[PDB]
Write a protein that binds this ligand. Structure first.
Ligand code: ATP
Ligand code: ADP
Ligand code: ADP
Ligand code: MG
Ligand code: MG
Lengths: 511, 464, 48, 468, 49, 49
């Protein structure tokens, strides 16, 4: 490896050039005020001795306020600061798939250099209102609750909002894993490249997420942009924009991108820290007057481009951590306003065994049926009303005798459907399997099954079909609809399996 | 006589001018960002005179890439938007720039977006009803001509179809025009609305002004004034009746709060700008009827934490004349428009304004529907069998009434080929009087879906 | 019959209680935002 | 080349140096207080460069008696503490001075207390249960060997009793080194822990670093860094497993916020410093295991005013592998340890690691307790008779389960006067599986209060007149 | 205050005056706005002391 | 602090002391008043850091 350093030294060279310089006039808490640099731009990248990097955020006649992106303890009064003549930008290319990088695009996984196709500024404007087309292609998360009740289309921004330890990262990782089959298809119109931005997470949590993606083979098409908790507030503030820039490079080349921001609340905290350290006026919750602008400009770059621009898209999955399930807090309010739909995860549902703990009563997707395939649209049509009626009637659980036949049937169906939407972790379901399971639930084929068995039944039946009657899945996948003949064959298969099935209590599930 | 940038802090820019060249407050200034990647012309709005020939301005575009000392040109006037009939059918941003056709409208007449409301004398002392032609709206929640209507409704409730319907009715019945103001507009939703209005062939009757989510707070604060200026030109100069849509007005309030915070002003209660009432009043007082012509406004309102006492909704409702709530429940029934006749209300549903007959008929309809809603839970749990005979009769009558509040709308033709209907107010009053009295309970329920007046009811009954 | 009447009365009482409690909670929420801003801006002014 | 004191305001001192002699950030400076009663040597940590050759420093000792204009000397380096096997069995302060044997360790190798965390490429997730013998912890908040464990809770809920219990259960037989960092806690508790470790013979293997709540803010800021430096040396140089006990880590953040406004920083939400998350992130990210090098850290985190939404505990939550959350409500019921089973969490509580049966029993317990929590208000107002039959059965089961999650701990013998107990994990799983199935519904719930395993349950039921 | 002065001019000449303030909540809000723009420390509900 | 010092003199001489502070909230209020009058930057409830 001595040859490695020998190559750099034999290639290393420097040349003097007329440079504009400033001097650090003060420094503290990750901020540095530097005099001089008359021609420095706003957001220009500055270099301090020892290869330290800063961003000029606050320009006045006296000095420049600069956010130091790391190793701030090396900053010292009197040090010479050089301008780069460049705003923040990051490398972009296909080489970033399977790599972990910091918000500057520098690999942190220790796997060598990354070959950058080009460079992209972090603040390039989002596609205009005339450069887009309607979100009309499903982005299958593989999670039945989401794919049926709050479907996500390509180019949508679906917020995942909830308290800590409710499964938000689980849902996002399941989505990324579900993209595996689409990746293996090899067709760029079906492939989805994934960017996972980790802001303010401890490094071992990021390592665990990467391990989970490795297990499912997702790192072949996933890039991680990591700004762990030890990183400077500059990296935590910039990481979503780095991930967005990589995703945009793919999006503008006709590719489809799914970007997860885990989580934007930590980015908001980092930006608030920077703004307060720069003495900018604070507002509600001490946030600056442009935190909403921060998140809105970040999330408007997720779009579905028109065919004139290659038809690529980037889907955003921002994550927000609420406290005490207070969605009216400042940052949750802003991000809810920005996004197209919201998946609300709740601790009470989680502890009840409802996992993923999506509150389907309040979870919404403004794109809606436009982001579903025809089969899912058919089978999932009744789910909303069924579950709403079930929640209305659940107060009468012990009084089924007092309920007329219709109400008791509604209650039983609701229990079956609630069990149906439950899903184990790290188990994305293909769209055809989801369609078949929802069909089971909504066509009364789970009525004869005990509630506590529904899940197992579902799973077993799905394994049966895939083993012996895979033509149903084929048909559904290729045509994206459930044909009459396929539906009849599915009903016959379900009834035969019911013949074969045995409940936990032992009673037959036939008829 | 040109200024130069001295300080830059996010969207807030300080500019120094010579002694005799200090721009007036709210004047528009132009700076230049020349960095290749981010090159643009930056619009600044003078917010304060700091003294010593320094002005503090709000950048209408991101300041990323701006340099200290670059020239700043005073335009001599505030933000001015193009006006005239030419703005119809095109999409503009808060600064008047055409988005669907850059450079379009640059030669039109330009009006400053900062204008006073009509003089006290010029106002009409008498509140007038805006006969839309929709049965539910005309009967239960009549709209005030020149007044403000709050719109509440989730997704998939026909809100967009209702907006298209109102555009159609203002264009055809009153020979008027529409201005849509997207305050804090989602770019995807703005594109959707543009395409849908083009497909409905109502874009020609509408002027779209978008201040999008991903713009600094200044544009989101001024987009409402821009759209209102276009509407004011249509009213005062073209002598038209205008319909102005604002979605969302709360985002105008929130952008005002953000701008106030950026300028260092101390927040008022609950963190809103100290002049929240003043700003909302300046916006809303310009929407009124003057000299026989009116701007009527339908405004989407967001209520923070569902708290109607929150300062933002509390200030907004000081100016709202009617409320229209769109219900998932009504929509699921197939009743269009999915108006909630019980949650919705109008301030002019008083005998002194609409007359005693209209008031009595509307009150009877409301009473019947409220009683039916009370019985709904019994019907759901124990079934309709447990109901009394009088209860069953009332349930049937209420079902027929609630289904006769549906209407075949003009904007619904593109979905269901049937053309829309326009029921006269007196016809609706008499028809619902008869329905309440119990003169149609024998007819089948299906006969009451999506029809106009009594003639259509008779024809649909015969067809069954 | 009297149980039906009593449970109707109790449900209405719970409605009134929930309304009053929600009003109190919204007042407390607004007051908390105002007090947080008061402390933040007081500190900021002291620093200035 | 020496500086002089310009401004003194509590724990923050401004020092002016000659041009070109300005000390680097975090350097240790020395000043003299000569007043006889309070004569001492102040150690000041350079916190900011103010420009014009002034630095703002945080004093590590009280500044009473300090005088403007006194000479200030720059050590040229950060605060450094002794490292090596010698520190074991001895008590130090944040500055590295030995308290039990003053002057001890002065000749040891010294490490700066400011350090970058391990590189991301060196981090490996840890998934291996650390059995404690506490039923609730082992069932619902399984601890991770080499992972990060926290004990959250408000004042006086049992954080320190549980820390001492975990010392007894884990460090008593640990094959590696233990570091106990007392961050801003009671001096009486520190003396009690010192005596207890000496009696248990665990002191020989433990290094104690104390900065008490009576110390100025700077000492409470830096004591955690000092203890963490000792632990980092043991991890990276000696290559042996390390136990790191911190009590209370919230005091680091509190001390940081005590000087934030005196340092010139505009306050953030809830009165905290704007840099809360960043400072916490640096400190916490230093407290980790790296590939092949284990640090099992256990932190007590104080929840201000029982408000779990407070920014300090909320920010801390992201740094932990397992979190035992103690509740005031559980405490006031007399249930000890006052663990909130519905609010605690463990990253290894999944079928893949702990196994199907453990996960199943834990989920069933949590579901039953959640349903009971939902029914509490109904039982309080309308009474238990108005519940459905299955709901009544579930309520009885849940009351028995919540009592059985209680346990008599050894560290609690001083309070209850009752000796502690240790329950194997398999016994815990079997017992709670029996409970969730209703196999103990015939026993009075009082039989389940503050006992160990099923043998203790049978004994107590016999004492109360029941029998299983 | 303008209305009160106009009324007081009559009141002090032996006349009887009826003055209506519709409404003082909005005056209080306006005065709070003025005080906050003067940077006067606010009190309860952000109103000046 | 005066009471604590008086008690400490006895404590450091083999005596046993009991000291009652009635009450510390008033002392905290007085210290807050002192700090605000010295224009020290306030914290929660205007109390000093
Ligand atoms: N569908 C599921 N089934 C079972 N367990 C699940 C499911 N989803 C998540 N979990 C578990 O719930 C716990 C919380 O999951 P996760 O960390 O993804 O949530 P989070 O809200 O992002 O958490 P945090 O606040 O720690 O970031 C983990 O133990 C995860 O294994
Ligand atoms: N009168 C109607 N006839 C047929 N379909 C309707 C009618 N009103 C609403 N809809 C349907 O309901 C949906 C409502 O969506 P949209 O128009 O976007 O309003 P919203 O914004 O409330 O969802 C539309 O997709 C439309 O197809
Ligand atoms: N397991 C227990 N059994 C009985 N009493 C306990 C137990 N744990 C704590 N306590 C009581 O609660 C008090 C608070 O415990 P401690 O951990 O010292 O406070 P904190 O939780 O604030 O650190 C103890 O002094 C003791 O009296
Ligand atoms: Mg997570
Ligand atoms: Mg303690």
């Amino acid at each position: 490896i001595e040859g490695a350093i020998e190559d750099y030294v034999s290639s290393f060279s420097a040349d003097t050039e007329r440079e504009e310089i400033g001097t650090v006039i003060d420094a503290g808490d990750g901020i540095a005020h530097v005099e001089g640099l008359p021609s420095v731009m706003t957001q220009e990248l500055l270099e301090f001795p020892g290869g330290v990097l800063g961003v000029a955020l606050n320009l006045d006649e006296h000095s420049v306020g600069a956010v130091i992106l790391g190793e701030f303890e090396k900053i010292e009064e009197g040090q010479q600061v050089k301008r780069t003549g460049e705003v923040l930008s990051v490398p972009v290319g296909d080489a970033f798939l399977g790599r972990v990088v910091n918000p500057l695009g520098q690999p942190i996984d220790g796997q060598g250099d990354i070959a950058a196709e080009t460079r992209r500024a972090l603040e390039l404007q989002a596609p205009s209102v005339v450069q887009r087309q309607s979100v009309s292609e499903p982005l299958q998360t593989g999670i039945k609750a989401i794919d049926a009740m709050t479907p996500i289309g390509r180019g949508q921004r679906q917020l995942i909002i909830g308290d800590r330890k409710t499964g938000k990262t689980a849902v996002c990782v399941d989505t990324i894993l579900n993209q595996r089959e689409a990746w293996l298809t090899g067709d760029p119109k079906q492939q989805v490249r994934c960017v996972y931005v980790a802001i303010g997470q401890k490094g071992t949590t990021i390592a665990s997420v990467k391990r989970a993606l490795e297990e499912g083979g997702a790192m072949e098409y996933t890039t991680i942009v990591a700004a762990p908790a030890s990183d400077a507030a500059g990296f935590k503030w910039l990481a979503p924009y780095t991930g967005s820039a990589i995703g945009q490079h793919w999006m503008y080349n006709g590719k489809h991108v799914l970007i997860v921001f885990d989580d934007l609340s930590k980015q908001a905290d980092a930006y608030r820290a920077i703004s307060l350290l720069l003495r900018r006026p604070p507002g509600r919750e001490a946030f600056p007057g442009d935190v909403f602008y921060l998140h809105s400009r970040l999330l408007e770059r997720c779009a579905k481009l028109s065919d004139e621009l290659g038809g690529g898209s980037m889907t955003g999955l921002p994550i927000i951590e609420t406290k005490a399930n207070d969605i009216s807090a400042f940052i949750p309010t802003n991000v809810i306003s920005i996004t197209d739909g919201q998946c609300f995860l709740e601790s009470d549902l989680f502890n009840q065994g409802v996992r993923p703990a999506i509150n389907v009563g309040v979870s919404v997707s403004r794109v809606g049926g436009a982001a579903q395939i025809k089969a899912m649209k058919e089978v999932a049509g009744s789910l909303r009303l069924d579950l709403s009626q079930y929640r209305e009637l659940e107060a009468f659980a012990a009084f089924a005798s007092d309920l007329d036949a219709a109400s008791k049937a509604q209650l039983d169906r609701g229990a079956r459907l609630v069990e149906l939407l439950k899903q184990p972790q790290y188990s994305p379901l293909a769209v055809e399997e989801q369609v078949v399971a929802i069909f089971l639930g909504t066509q009364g084929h789970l009525d004869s099954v005990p509630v506590e068995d529904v899940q197992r039944f579902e799973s077993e039946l799905l394994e049966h079909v895939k083993a012996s009657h895979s033509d149903i899945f084929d048909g559904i996948r290729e045509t994206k609809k459930l044909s009459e003949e396929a539906e009849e064959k599915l009903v016959s298969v379900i009834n035969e399996f019911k013949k074969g099935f045995q409940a936990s209590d032992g009673s037959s599930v036939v008829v | 006589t040109a200024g130069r940038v001295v300080r830059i802090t996010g969207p807030v820019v300080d500019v120094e001018f010579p002694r005799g060249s200090v721009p007036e407050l709210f004047n528009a200034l132009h700076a230049e960002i020349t960095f290749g990647a981010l090159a643009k012309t930056l619009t600044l709005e003078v917010a304060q005179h700091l003294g010593d020939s320094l002005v503090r301005c709000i950048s209408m575009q991101p300041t990323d890439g701006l340099v200290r000392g670059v020239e700043v040109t005073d335009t001599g006037a505030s933000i001015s938007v193009p006006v005239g009939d030419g703005v119809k059918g095109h999409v503009f941003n808060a600064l008047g720039d055409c988005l669907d056709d850059p450079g379009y409208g640059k030669d039109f007449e330009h009006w400053s977006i900062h204008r006073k409301p009509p003089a006290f004398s010029d106002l009409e002392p008498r509140t007038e009803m805006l006969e839309t032609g929709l049965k539910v709206v005309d009967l239960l929640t009549p709209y005030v001509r020149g007044g403000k209507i709050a719109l509440f409704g989730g997704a998939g409730v026909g809100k967009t179809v209702l907006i298209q319907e109102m555009i159609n009715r203002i264009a055809r019945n009153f020979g008027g025009t529409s201005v849509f103001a997207g305050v804090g507009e989602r770019t995807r939703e703005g594109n959707d609305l543009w395409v849908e209005l083009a497909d409905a062939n109502v874009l020609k009757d509408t002027a779209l002004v978008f201040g999008q989510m991903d713009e600094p707070p200044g544009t989101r604060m001024r987009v409402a004034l821009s759209a209102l200026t276009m509407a004011e030109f249509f009213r005062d100069e073209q002598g038209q009746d205008v319909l102005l849509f604002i979605d969302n007005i709360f985002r105008f309030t929130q952008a005002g709060s953000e701008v106030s915070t950026l300028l260092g002003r101390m927040p008022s209660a609950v963190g809103y700008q100290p002049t929240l009432a003043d700003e909302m009043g300046e916006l809303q007082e310009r929407i009124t009827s003057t000299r026989g012509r009116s701007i009527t406004s339908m405004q989407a309102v967001y209520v923070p934490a569902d708290d109607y006492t929150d300062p933002a909704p509390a200030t907004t409702f000081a100016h709202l004349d009617a409320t229209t709530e769109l219900s998932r429940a009504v929509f699921s029934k197939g009743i269009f428009p999915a108006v909630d006749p019980l949650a919705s209300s109008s301030t002019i549903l008083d005998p002194a304004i609409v007359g005693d007959e209209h008031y009595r008929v509307a009150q009877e309809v409301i009473r019947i529907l409220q009683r039916y809603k009370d019985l709904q839970d019994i019907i759901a749990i124990l079934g309709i069998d447990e109901l009394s005979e009088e209860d069953k009769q009332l349930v049937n009558r209420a079902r027929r009434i609630e289904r006769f509040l549906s209407q075949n709308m003009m904007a619904a033709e593109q979905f269901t080929g049937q053309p829309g209907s326009t029921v006269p107010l007196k016809e609706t009053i008499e028809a619902f009087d008869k329905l309440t009295k119990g003169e149609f309970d024998h007819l089948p329920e299906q006969a009451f879906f999506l029809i106009g007046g009594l003639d259509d009811l008779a024809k649909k009954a015969e067809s069954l | 019959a009297s149980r039906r009447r009593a449970m109707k009365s109790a449900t209405d009482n719970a409605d009134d209680l929930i309304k009053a409690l929600t009003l109190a909670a919204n007042r407390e929420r607004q007051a908390q935002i105002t007090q947080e801003i008061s402390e933040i801006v007081g500190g900021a002014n002291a620093l200035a």
